[PDB]
Curated annotation (Swiss-Prot):
Ca(2+) 2 binds at D16, N18, D20, Y22, E27. It comes from Homo sapiens. The lineage of its organism: Eukaryota, Metazoa, Chordata, Craniata, Vertebrata. The modification Phosphoserine is found at S9. It comes from the Eukaryota. Cardiac muscle Tn-C can bind 3 calcium ions per molecule. Domain I does not bind calcium. Belongs to the troponin C family. Ca(2+) 3 binds at D52, N54, D56, R58, E63. This is Troponin C, slow skeletal and cardiac muscles. Troponin is the central regulatory protein of striated muscle contraction. Tn consists of three components: Tn-I which is the inhibitor of actomyosin ATPase, Tn-T which contains the binding site for tropomyosin and Tn-C. The binding of calcium to Tn-C abolishes the inhibitory action of Tn on actin filaments. The chain holds residues 91 to 161 of 161 of the full protein. Signal peptide: none annotated. The gene is TNNC1. Residues 3-38, 39-72 form the EF-hand domain. It is linked to Cardiomyopathy, dilated, 1Z: A disorder characterized by ventricular dilation and impaired systolic function, resulting in congestive heart failure and arrhythmia. Patients are at risk of premature death. Cardiomyopathy, familial hypertrophic, 13: A hereditary heart disorder characterized by ventricular hypertrophy, which is usually asymmetric and often involves the interventricular septum. The symptoms include dyspnea, syncope, collapse, palpitations, and chest pain. They can be readily provoked by exercise. The disorder has inter- and intrafamilial variability ranging from benign to malignant forms with high risk of cardiac failure and sudden cardiac death.
Amino acid sequence: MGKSEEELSDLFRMFDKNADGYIDLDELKIMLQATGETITEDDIEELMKDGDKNNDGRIDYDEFLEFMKDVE
Ligand SMILES: [Ca+2]
Ligand SMILES: [Ca+2]
């Protein structure tokens, strides 16, 4: 938070699971598998709608930077 694009770049690394460069809804499920939660596909897709400008069902590094640039 605090209007920082660099923080968004670091957080994107936390979201991708295969080191493939794109966050897919299934890579996002692995983050919930780490918490031990079962996720429905819409929960992951609604999270993408907040910041994914394309609404493509996957967050690119650039789409991820768009999600929380400001948070202030
Ligand atoms: Ca990925
Ligand atoms: Ca996307």
